[PDB]
Design a protein around this nucleic acid. Structure first.
Ligand SMILES: [Mg+2]
Ligand SMILES: [Mg+2]
Ligand SMILES: [Mg+2]
Ligand SMILES: [Mg+2]
Ligand SMILES: [Mg+2]
Ligand SMILES: [Mg+2]
Ligand SMILES: [Mg+2]
Ligand SMILES: [Mg+2]
Ligand SMILES: [Mg+2]
Ligand SMILES: [Mg+2]
Ligand SMILES: [Mg+2]
Ligand SMILES: [Mg+2]
Ligand SMILES: [Mg+2]
Ligand SMILES: [Mg+2]
Ligand SMILES: [Mg+2]
Ligand SMILES: [Mg+2]
Ligand SMILES: [Mg+2]
Ligand SMILES: [Mg+2]
Ligand SMILES: [Mg+2]
Ligand SMILES: [Mg+2]
Ligand SMILES: [Mg+2]
Ligand SMILES: [Mg+2]
Ligand SMILES: [Mg+2]
Ligand SMILES: [Mg+2]
Ligand SMILES: [Mg+2]
Ligand SMILES: [Mg+2]
Ligand SMILES: [Mg+2]
Ligand SMILES: [Mg+2]
Ligand SMILES: [Mg+2]
Ligand SMILES: [Mg+2]
Ligand SMILES: [Mg+2]
Ligand SMILES: [Mg+2]
Ligand SMILES: [Mg+2]
Ligand SMILES: [Mg+2]
Ligand SMILES: [Mg+2]
Ligand SMILES: [Mg+2]
Ligand SMILES: [Mg+2]
Ligand SMILES: [Mg+2]
Ligand SMILES: [Mg+2]
Ligand SMILES: [Mg+2]
Ligand SMILES: [Mg+2]
Ligand SMILES: [Mg+2]
Ligand SMILES: [Mg+2]
Ligand SMILES: [Mg+2]
Ligand SMILES: [Mg+2]
Ligand SMILES: [Mg+2]
Ligand SMILES: [Mg+2]
Ligand SMILES: [Mg+2]
Ligand SMILES: [Mg+2]
Ligand SMILES: [Mg+2]
Ligand SMILES: [Mg+2]
Ligand SMILES: [Mg+2]
Ligand SMILES: [Mg+2]
Ligand SMILES: [Mg+2]
Lengths: 150, 129, 142
RNA sequence: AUAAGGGAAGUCGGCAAAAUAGAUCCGUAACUUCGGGAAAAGGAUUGGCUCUAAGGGUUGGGCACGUUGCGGCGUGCGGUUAACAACCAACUUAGAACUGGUACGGACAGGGGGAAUCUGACUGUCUAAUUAAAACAUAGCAUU
RNA sequence: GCGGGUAAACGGCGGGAGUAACUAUGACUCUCUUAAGGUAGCCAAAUGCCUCGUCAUCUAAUUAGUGACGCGCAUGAAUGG
RNA sequence: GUAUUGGCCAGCCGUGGUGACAACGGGUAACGGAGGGUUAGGGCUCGACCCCGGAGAAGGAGCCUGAGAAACGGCUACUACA
RNA sequence: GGUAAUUCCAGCUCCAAUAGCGUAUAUUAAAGUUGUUGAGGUUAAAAAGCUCGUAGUUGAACCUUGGGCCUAGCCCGCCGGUACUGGCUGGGCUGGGCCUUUCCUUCUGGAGAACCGCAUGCCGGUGUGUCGGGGAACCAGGACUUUUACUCUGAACAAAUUAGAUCGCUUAAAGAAGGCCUAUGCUUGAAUACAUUAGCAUGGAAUAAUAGAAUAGGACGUGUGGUUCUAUUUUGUUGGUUUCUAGGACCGCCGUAAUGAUUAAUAGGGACAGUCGGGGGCGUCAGUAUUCAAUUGUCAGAGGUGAAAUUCUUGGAUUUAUUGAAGACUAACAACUGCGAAAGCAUUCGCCAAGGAUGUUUUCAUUAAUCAGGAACGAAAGUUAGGGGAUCGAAGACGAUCAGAUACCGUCGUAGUCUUAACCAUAAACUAUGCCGAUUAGGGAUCGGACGGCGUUUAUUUUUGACCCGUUCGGCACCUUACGAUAAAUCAAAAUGUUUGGGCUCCUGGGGGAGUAUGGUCGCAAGGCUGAAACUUAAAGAAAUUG
RNA sequence: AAAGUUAUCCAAACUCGGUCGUUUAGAGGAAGUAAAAGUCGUAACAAGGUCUCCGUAGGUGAACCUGCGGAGGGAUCAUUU
């Protein structure tokens, strides 16, 4: 099922069979990218630019409209984040939970939880290191990890 | 996790045939599966098959008409010389007159009977009778 | 069921095998060689000894008899064991200090029949043979 | 103070005396409150003379112009001497050859050790002028 | 005076007869007796008269030493084991 | 130095080498191999011994002659027997 | 075998092998009772209490297929004639060329034919060949080609042995001998395959791994600048220098090109939205009850048991009403209902972090499954230091029953039962049933999210909230049925297993001795983990039938 | 060119001490198995006359008893406004 559970949910999204824009879209690929770059500099992580553009006006899938992937666009325009967003958010969650635990000494379950979060951090960092996005000498030290997020 | 789509396909076919069905569902499709089906057809053991092509992996629908006894898969792909290839036919085939053991070699996959005429050996992938 | 099945997993199967083999009684008996160490016979078939006295032992509950065993002194290591005398009437022939020859019952380290705690039988006395003397094929030397 | 051979056979009792002793290098048990026991037990070297090696300090680094009488400066701008040259200064450590009536911490100075039992946990204190101990005190524990 | 509590308060914590297919012992049982009848432990020990107790070890020889045995004249739990 | 390479040995300078993918050590009633016994197939067990290779002449060391020996139906010395 | 012995000691008769037969020990089959092929793990011996995680094992799909042709070789079938030949658009079978956007790298040298033609021979070409327009095929040499695994064919490799061909030592076990008319002679054999691990070459290119262009540091050009190095022979000889030239390394400018990025797995990770629960931690609020205490009224009994007594009582017991204090616990609601990895979790409210499921035309793109050692958690009881100490109650003291009663019954009662800071790591820790993945039959309930619909109820009222009908996802469960499985009880898994192979981890082999002795390791201790041997025995054990 | 001689090297052999492995004696203490017509009780198998079993702690001549938390392998698959 999932890495740490026995649940078997299947909630997800289904990609339509068609790979062509609808006839009512009438939006060129060139203009959208600059809107993407302004929102990226405005602060949104690549995750929610798609949902905000989808909700606000028109484009549901950026790939079919422009022929290029969203992160690829940001990388080619020099706006890619230094650290991947999923690992960034996982670190932020782990630091905030540790911050709660040192204040609440006898919060007995969160000690068990921290092992799961840190083990997933180590597995994802090992993948990123073995693929080359992060330098091979990068290490996750719990003491100063709070500075990386903010 | 899924470790043998071929094993899943043959198991589902064997179950449906034992249950008297006429059509079967195979979720994953691969080159080994598709090349397996014509080999099945050339001896009359199955009928028409259709593979609908969704963009993910495709599916398989083969049509059965009875006439099929069993179809199994050997999971560890052993290495067999040419001289002892008759040991396997002695092991897991009811008789030499009918039944086929399928091998994979550098010249495509084929049954053990045409493989003997090709004077070639390789790895074992399944059997049917 | 449940064994490793991979194509390069022969190491787990052979290494796991030896420990499991110890669970066999015959294997343990051979491997520790207690017969070479603990058994009265030094892993051999026969042995020679000297009789010291004749003792009678009563059988278990359903039967009722005296089995007429004998005490023997081993030359090899000087320990004391008890042995049986087969056929009938052999006790008269077998005197004290008679240089007997012994063998086993074939029960492989456990008691045989109704005779308790005795594992050996006399084959020869003064090197002539019991059954031959019983059938008067030979005469016991003095 | 010294004594041939024996080495506690003397005596209530090894009382008195003798034996070991510095430094460098090896090696070190049972037990344990894991801090110890431990310098455990038990071994090897130590002179004279002639040499070798190691451990430091101080002063010096290119052009391009302008004042002051070959020099102190004021500057601007390059390179890190593949670390060079001179002078100065006490001791500590390691190694080699030769040498002797085989001796060398040559005087002085300088732990005998091991296997067990009784008793008090330890350091400490008292009958000045016959008893320093198992006696007293101690931290800890409990009660009013 | 009468009636309750209190032992890390002072202190205390027993005798006699029978009984298992040899012999020995007594698991077991009757009996007198009051505040309770020495539990866990330990021992010829600095505490035992009979005593130089009995067995083993150390010695050529040991009233000495050590390890065990326990109806202990008269061991024993903060008078602490 | 050896018939010759080589930490085989003598000096100087670095701090290395093997290991859970089983190192290191303890047992072996262990000379190794060609091979013997037993069979549907897969295996289990034996192999001092007629063929090939290695080591030894009671236990250790040292050496002459000779192309070839650290030899024992060659020598020297100790230990135990005689 | 205890007085008519089918089983002992004898006589008759009979049985098995036969110049051989019995006994002891070792070893193999028997043994699918060691099990890769091929063995059990709900109850017969056996799934670690639970989760994370390292070695180790296993890992989703995707890249040149097909067509049209033509012909060679090689078998086999058939038909007949005749020893035996042709034929059959016979069946193939192995290819070897083609074109389809694909076909096949490359240099030099040797060698050297074919095709057309010639002179002479002849009757339009040839043997001439000491033909030239030649240039199939071969040989000997240079330059490049992802690398492993895998398979086919070769080379090299011991005599003996095994299988195995030949020869009548009178046959045979053996042996490599012998044979032929008549010979003063001739002739032959003394074979062959396998071993099988590692190493050396060749063809095939499926299956299983690996590398390549993304900050272009990418491919090409006889395009053109360079800036570096080398040096054949040619100018008489030698030396020195230069030019052109040939080749090698590196860096620019321009041009050429379809200029370089696979899907988005009912695999996984992350984001977002409305929700859901007795999941966790801290603080706070409430509830009766129990015990104790105070005030108030009366008078002889009150407790408990099959039945009594111990105990409390006019020094007013028990009971009645009001008030106060202390600690523990949250009835009914409460269920074949919910949450958590398990152990476990129920009074109100506030704060803090965490989680599942649903919805989604958000995001990354194999990031994954099980794990030897290793690590976190782990009921109750127990241990070390403080606080608290209502109720029960190990130990203990009394009252009864009984022949005895150190118990069951009744009145008291210490540790403990609560909490703070640290240890212990075992339970029938049970679903006696390991984890991941695929398929297999009908039904109706039910908890959470989403979607559709006819109506009722109701409000500063509509949409929302409550009820009803149908579909779907994810759970805790249940009834019938067997095509299936088991020795059976029984099972939608305990099925898809003699027609036996999806991936991963652990444990058992007749009963006792024994979870014992000893060694090691953790802990203050109690104890935990690992874990034998001597000896003894023919039965223990499981499910069901009749009593 | 012989005996003898000085200094290294290769080194048998002996003495003392340390360590590893095997066999074996030992007062006394404490277990297991078998053979019994032994003594004392009756814990378990029926609701075995107090339902049985598991973990933990204490107590008693002995089987055993009691406290706390679990399990049914139980003597209940089940009780409605
Ligand atoms: Mg996992
Ligand atoms: Mg799923
Ligand atoms: Mg003297
Ligand atoms: Mg003297
Ligand atoms: Mg002396
Ligand atoms: Mg004396
Ligand atoms: Mg005297
Ligand atoms: Mg003195
Ligand atoms: Mg010393
Ligand atoms: Mg000492
Ligand atoms: Mg000197
Ligand atoms: Mg000295
Ligand atoms: Mg003592
Ligand atoms: Mg003192
Ligand atoms: Mg004084
Ligand atoms: Mg004094
Ligand atoms: Mg006593
Ligand atoms: Mg005494
Ligand atoms: Mg005394
Ligand atoms: Mg004593
Ligand atoms: Mg004495
Ligand atoms: Mg003396
Ligand atoms: Mg007294
Ligand atoms: Mg006293
Ligand atoms: Mg006293
Ligand atoms: Mg290393
Ligand atoms: Mg040997
Ligand atoms: Mg041999
Ligand atoms: Mg030989
Ligand atoms: Mg020799
Ligand atoms: Mg020699
Ligand atoms: Mg000789
Ligand atoms: Mg010789
Ligand atoms: Mg079995
Ligand atoms: Mg059972
Ligand atoms: Mg069982
Ligand atoms: Mg279990
Ligand atoms: Mg695959
Ligand atoms: Mg009143
Ligand atoms: Mg409530
Ligand atoms: Mg609820
Ligand atoms: Mg483990
Ligand atoms: Mg607890
Ligand atoms: Mg307390
Ligand atoms: Mg009671
Ligand atoms: Mg009470
Ligand atoms: Mg507690
Ligand atoms: Mg357990
Ligand atoms: Mg479990
Ligand atoms: Mg609705
Ligand atoms: Mg039964
Ligand atoms: Mg004894
Ligand atoms: Mg009972
Ligand atoms: Mg039952």
């Amino acid at each position: 099922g999932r890495l740490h559970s026995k649940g078997k949910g299947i909630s997800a999204s289904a990609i339509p069979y068609s790979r062509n824009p609808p006839a009512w879209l009438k939006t060129t690929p060139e203009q959208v990218v600059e809107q993407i770059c302004k929102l990226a500099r405005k602060g949104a992580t690549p995750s929610q630019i798609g949902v905000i553009l989808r909700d606000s006006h028109g484009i549901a899938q950026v790939k079919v409209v422009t022929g290029n992937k969203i992160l690829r666009i940001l990388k080619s325009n020099g706006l890619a984040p230094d650290i991947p967003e999923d690992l960034y958010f996982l670190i932020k969650k782990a630091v905030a939970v540790r911050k709660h635990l040192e204040r609440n000494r006898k919060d007995k379950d969160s000690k068990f939880r921290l092992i799961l979060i840190e083990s997933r951090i180590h597995r994802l960092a090992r993948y990123y290191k073995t693929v080359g996005v992060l330098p091979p000498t990068w290490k996750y030290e719990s003491s100063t990890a709070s500075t990386l997020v903010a | 996790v899924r470790t043998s789509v071929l094993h899943d396909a043959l198991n589902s076919i064997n179950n449906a045939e034992k249950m008297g069905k006429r059509q079967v569902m195979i979720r994953p499709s691969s080159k080994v599966i598709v090349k397996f089906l014509q080999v099945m057809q050339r001896h009359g053991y199955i009928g028409e098959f259709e593979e609908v092509d969704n963009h993910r992996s495709g599916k398989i629908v083969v049509q059965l008409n009875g006439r099929l006894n069993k179809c199994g898969v050997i999971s560890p792909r052993y290495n067999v010389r040419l001289a002892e290839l008759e040991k396997w036919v002695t092991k897991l085939l009811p008789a030499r007159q009918f039944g086929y053991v399928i091998l994979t070699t550098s010249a495509g996959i084929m049954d053990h009977e045409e493989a003997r005429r090709k004077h070639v050996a390789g790895k074992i992938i399944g059997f049917f009778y | 069921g449940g064994k490793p099945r991979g194509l390069n997993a022969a190491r787990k199967l052979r290494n796991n095998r030896r420990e499991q083999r110890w669970a066999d009684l015959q294997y343990k008996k051979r491997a520790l060689g207690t017969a070479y160490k603990s058994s009265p016979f030094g892993g051999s078939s026969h042995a020679k000894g000297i009789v010291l006295e004749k003792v009678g032992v009563e059988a278990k509950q359903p039967n009722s008899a005296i089995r007429k065993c004998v005490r023997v002194q081993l030359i090899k290591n000087g320990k004391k064991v008890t042995a049986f005398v087969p056929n009938d009437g052999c006790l008269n022939f077998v005197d004290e200090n008679d240089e007997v020859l012994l063998a086993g019952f074939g029960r492989k380290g456990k008691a045989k029949g109704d005779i308790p705690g005795v594992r050996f039988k006399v084959v020869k006395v003064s090197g002539v043979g019991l059954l031959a003397l019983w059938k008067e094929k030979k005469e016991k030397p003095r």
